[PDB]
UniProtKB/Swiss-Prot annotation:
Role, per record: RNA-dependent RNA polymerase that performs primer-template recognition and RNA synthesis during viral replication. Initiates RNA transcription/replication at a flavin adenine dinucleotide (FAD), resulting in a 5'- FAD cap on viral RNAs. In this way, recognition of viral 5' RNA by host pattern recognition receptors can be bypassed, thereby evading activation of antiviral pathways.
Record's cofactor remark: Binds 2 magnesium ion that constitute a dinuclear catalytic metal center.
Catalytic activity: RNA(n) + a ribonucleoside 5'-triphosphate = RNA(n+1) + diphosphate
Modified positions (Phosphoserine) in chain numbering: S29, S42
Cofactor(s) this protein requires: Mg(2+)
Name of the molecule in the record: RNA-directed RNA polymerase
Post-translational modification: The N-terminus is phosphorylated by host PRK2/PKN2.
Lipid bilayer topology: Single-pass type IV membrane protein
Effect of I401V: In strain: Isolate pCV-J4L2S
Cellular compartments annotated: Host cytoplasm; Host endoplasmic reticulum membrane
Binding site for Mg(2+) 2: D216, D314, D315
Activity regulation note: Activity is up-regulated by PRK2/PKN2-mediated phosphorylation.
Residue span, RdRp catalytic domain: 210-328
Length: 559
């Protein structure tokens, strides 16, 4: 079927949209080529629509069916619990889109009579009505990027707040536990960045002669078929479920997940969707399971040897045993043809890689540096262009989610996060006297409230003390960072070092947690190094819940 059908009505904005970076007096300090930074708007919606609208092709075979049964067998061991309305409401982000039925996120979190009553009625409706397609809103996503030698806006589709809370009640436990049960070590969201690196390095070293490749599916969401979504449900149905949860999943599958009507911000009928909606609770879990199923089966059809998958939603990386240069190239092409028959055609053509550092997955790659002792330390990094472009935007405008904070946390050991992000933002927080103000950021799609002053402990717990002492980064990494700085007009190393020394001195003079930040985060800026010992508060931190499952588009808030 067609991934989408359009009536002609436009994808409209719900308010004024900004596309250019403001001439802010603080962003210029970070990067001077502000005209290279832009934010996607609804003005590019039609370009996106054209790209994601097509008739899907899907041919399933014995390998696909064999893998599916293997997956259902593992899912059969799971017992999922139904969440109470109270628990589901608590998972709702403070600024989640308000309901059109007279209440908003704040009311939901406070369990106001009107919110709870409506949510109960929506739930009862899911139990009684197994067919009525649920209405959804389609909007052009606003994301920041750097121009390339421009990307049209992504299309986000989501149902009303009332329905979102019901999804949580019926499926939050399922999407948080089932992927792990079914895919085991191949489920990427169970790993912190350091653990992902560990799994990738260990997997790579377990092969006699490793070969790996990332596989980019062309607009994954639009390639997901009605069949794929019902297969996904068949996996969920293998769980032991409360009667009402079983019905809710059945109803949500047919009324929401497989497709439904699209309405714009103005309330006009925009069209119909017959593929994956980006804004529902099962999107991350569903995409992960679907990608894993197709890829695992494709590997068998392609005769790839000893394939180890690492899947994060629609993001896939495969590491296997090489059968020789020519053989690998042929097997990869066969893999691609199999994925294409499964309705997972390639975007960027895949290529075999024989160097782990050259494989980019989840927009990142493994690289190596050295700790104070001179020992090699593996860590996760990525091209800093997008992170810096977004950091500039967030410096110029107030944004609900602070990607710069998430990036400092996830990429703390990198040369760029330490030299630029830490220096830039701690300088600003100092100047505005906002060091202790908690900020929201996202980790694997879930929203978290984090105190900047707690970064030292967080970083030590997630990355280890070496994160504060890494040096001698790889030639490849240095070149990439350097090129990015030239491209964006970011000040050179010397400028950041001078700014860091100044920021460090100020933080130290404040004592308390601020001084700890100065000591650990900026030890790289001084010659007279400080002996960095284990931070007491680090051993008392439980960040376990931070890396359990993916929730992008799931409207999830973890307090
Ligand atoms: O390997 C390193 N080993 C140590 N330092 C010191 C250092 C500075 C900031 C930081 F947070 C961590 C550090 F350990 C470096 C500082 C800069 C650098 O990279 C460059 N070197 C020369 C020119 C340009 C660059 C780059 F644009 F920054 F990549 C590489 C290294
Ligand atoms: Mg974990
Ligand atoms: Mg893709």
């Amino acid at each position: 079927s067609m991934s989408y059908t359009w009536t002609g009505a436009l994808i409209t904005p719900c308010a004024a949209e900004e596309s250019k970076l403001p001439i802010n007096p603080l962003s210029n300090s970070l990067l001077r080529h502000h005209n290279m930074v832009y934010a996607t708007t609804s003005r590019s919606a039609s370009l996106r629509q054209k790209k994601v609208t097509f008739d899907r092709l899907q041919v399933l075979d014995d390998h696909y069916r064999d893998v599916l049964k293997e997956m259902k067998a593992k899912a059969s061991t799971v017992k999922a619990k139904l969440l109470s309305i109270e628990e589901a409401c608590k998972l709702t982000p403070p600024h989640s889109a308000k309901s059109k039925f007279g209440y908003g996120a704040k009311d939901v979190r406070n369990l106001s009579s009107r919110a709870v009553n409506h949510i109960r009625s929506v739930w009862e409706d899911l139990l009684e009505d197994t067919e009525t397609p649920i209405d959804t809103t389609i909007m052009a996503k606003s994301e920041v990027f750097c121009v390339q030698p421009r990307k049209p806006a992504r299309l986000i589709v989501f149902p009303d707040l009332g329905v979102r809370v019901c999804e949580k009640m019926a499926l939050y436990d399922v999407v948080s536990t089932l992927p792990q049960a079914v895919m085991g070590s191949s489920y990427g969201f169970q790993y912190s960045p350091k653990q992902r690196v560990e799994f990738l390095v260990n997997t790579w070293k377990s092969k006699k002669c490793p070969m790996g490749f990332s596989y980019d599916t062309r607009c994954f969401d639009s390639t997901v078929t009605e069949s794929d979504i019902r297969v996904e449900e068949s996996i969920y149905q293998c769980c032991d479920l409360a009667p009402e949860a079983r019905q809710a999943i059945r109803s949500l599958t047919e009324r929401l997940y497989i497709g439904g009507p699209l309405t714009n911000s103005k309330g006009q009928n925009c069209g119909y969707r017959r593929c994956r909606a980006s804004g529902v609770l099962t999107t991350s879990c569903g995409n992960t399971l679907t990608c894993y199923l197709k890829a695992t089966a494709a590997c068998r059809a392609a005769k790839l040897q000893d394939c180890t998958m690492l899947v994060n939603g629609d993001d896939l990386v495969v590491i296997c045993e090489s059968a020789g240069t020519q053989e690998d190239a042929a097997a990869l092409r066969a893999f691609t043809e199999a994925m294409t028959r499964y309705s997972a055609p390639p975007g960027d053509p895949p290529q075999p890689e024989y160097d782990l550092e050259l494989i980019t997955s989840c927009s990142s790659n493994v690289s190596v540096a050295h700790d104070a002792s001179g020992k090699r330390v593996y860590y996760l990094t990525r091209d800093p262009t997008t992170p810096l472009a977004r950091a500039a935007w967030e410096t110029a405008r107030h944004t609900p989610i602070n990607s710069w904070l998430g990036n400092i946390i996830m990429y703390a050991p990198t040369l760029w996060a330490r030299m630029i992000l830490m220096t830039h933002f701690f300088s600003i927080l100092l100047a505005q006297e906002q060091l202790e103000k908690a900020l929201d950021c996202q980790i694997y799609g879930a929203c978290y409230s984090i105190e900047p002053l707690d970064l030292p402990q967080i970083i030590e717990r997630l990355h280890g003390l070496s994160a504060f002492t890494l040096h001698s980064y790889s030639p490849g990494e240095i070149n990439r960072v350097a090129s990015c700085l030239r491209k964006l007009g970011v000040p050179p190393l010397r400028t950041w070092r001078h700014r860091a020394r100044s920021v460090r001195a100020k933080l130290l003079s404040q004592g308390g947690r601020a001084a700890t930040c100065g000591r650990y985060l900026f030890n790289w800026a001084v010659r007279t190094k400080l002996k960095l010992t284990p931070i007491p508060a680090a051993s008392q931190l439980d960040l376990s819940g931070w890396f359990v499952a993916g929730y992008s588009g799931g409207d999830i808030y973890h307090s």
